[PDB]
Amino acid sequence: FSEEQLNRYEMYRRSAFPKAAIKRLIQSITGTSVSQNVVIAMSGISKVFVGEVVEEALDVCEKWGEMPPLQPKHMREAVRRLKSKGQIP
């Protein structure tokens, strides 16, 4: 296989949202303190959420012929399909 595939999975595997901002964003709604689990937990669901968009976004990108980097038009035309498919809130 290639170093890019290797380097793309390594970036995948280790990428994650900063605990700091997930805690700050969550507590700006709850109005209260939240466990680290709630923060850790919330980060997987958020990562997964991102994953699903990019894939849709990528699939859009290519059927429209075009190529990455994904454009804002790819991001939004992807969000719609995932709602029509009922897969994201």
Binding site: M11, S15, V54
Partner: protein, 45 residues
């Protein structure tokens, strides 16, 4: 907020190793919006 980690996250999913900053912004919103919704939905139970 996440423009740099979400950037290495867009790569691990198939985007360019250098996603368009423009798009990384739209994505951060979708996420900030997402977390919130979940946050409201979760408390509700």
């Amino acid at each position: 907020l996440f423009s740099k980690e979400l950037r290495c996250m867009m790569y691990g999913f198939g985007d360019d190793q250098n996603p368009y900053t423009e798009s990384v912004d739209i994505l951060e919103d979708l996420v900030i919006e997402f977390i919130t919704e979940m946050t409201h939905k979760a408390m509700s139970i």
